[PDB]
């Protein structure tokens, strides 16, 4: 019935809202059911939701424990053929749900585009393993995932009260849920966190994905795939641990091919 369900999770969202709504309600060639997850708001929120057309829009107020536990609730009632989740200020760019309509008409499990920040391209990275020692690789509010996605992957972990949407993705690399990336530009983020827990919860990630690794060495191969710091250790923490997973050794070859010589050496010895 649906070919898109949009998920937005709202909170005090009065100032954006609209806007956000207009970008989903505009877009043309699908079929789009809106799901808004608020969060207890007392502004006009909900007033200037009820302002656009009801017929194909539900709103879920509960009580929630944070964000990523209103977008699983939303997640949970979809009915669309992919699901997105775009924040209350955020905005779709057009013609986009009908590129993630045409795309996974194919099957292709994921359809992921390009986000602008602040008047720039997300610094995006490839889904593949290289991805499992950063973060998320494409922005999460320019991810479409199928409802067969979500079945094989689940929902997002709420012991990650920042980084879950990067713990999914990585799941679903780790699963091979398949994706394709489209390079234009699905969703334009908004701009309107003490820096230490983002690390935190970033590094605990990628020990997720491999937990043979200490904290500050998940941190060192974080840095370093995103230009954060600097790379001269790599082939250390590449001959500490190659023998543990041929994942690992994938993964840092491909993030850091200047190693490819000593990545082959792990590849002859254990894999
Ligand atoms: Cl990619
Ligand atoms: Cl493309």
């Not at 920042?162 to 394709?180: F, L, N």
Request: glycine content about 8%; overall charge negative; aromatic content about 8%.
């Amino acid at each position: 019935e649906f070919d898109i369900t949009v998920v937005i999770p709202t909170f005090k969202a009065e100032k954006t809202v609209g806007q956000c709504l207009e970008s989903v309600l505009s877009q043309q060639g699908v079929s789009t059911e809106i799901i808004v997850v608020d969060g207890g708001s007392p502004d006009a929120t909900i007033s200037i939701v009820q302002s656009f057309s009801s017929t194909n829009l539900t709103i879920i107020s509960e009580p929630d424990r944070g964000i990523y536990d209103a977008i699983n609730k939303g997640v949970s009632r979809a009915q669309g053929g992919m699901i997105g989740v775009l924040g209350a200020d955020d905005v779709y760019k057009p013609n986009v749900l009908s590129v993630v309509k045409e795309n996974a008409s194919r099957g292709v499990e994921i359809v992921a585009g390009l986000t602008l920040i602040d008047g720039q391209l997300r610094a995006d990275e490839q889904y593949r393993p290289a991805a499992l020692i950063s973060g998320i690789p494409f922005g999460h509010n320019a991810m479409f995932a199928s409802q067969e996605a979500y079945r094989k992957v689940g929902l997002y972990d709420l012991a990650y009260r920042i980084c879950a949407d990067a713990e999914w993705v990585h799941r679903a690399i780790k699963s091979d849920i398949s994706c394709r990336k489209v390079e234009q530009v699905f969703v334009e983020f908004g701009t309107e966190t003490n820096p230490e827990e983002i690390i935190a919860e970033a590094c605990s990630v990628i020990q997720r994905n491999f937990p043979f690794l200490l904290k500050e060495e998940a941190k060192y191969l974080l840095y370093g795939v995103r230009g954060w710091g600097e790379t001269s250790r790599i082939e250390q923490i590449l001959r500490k641990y190659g023998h543990e997973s041929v994942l690992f050794v994938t993964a840092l070859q491909e993030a850091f091919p200047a190693v490819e010589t000593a990545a082959a050496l792990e590849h002859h010895h254990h894999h």
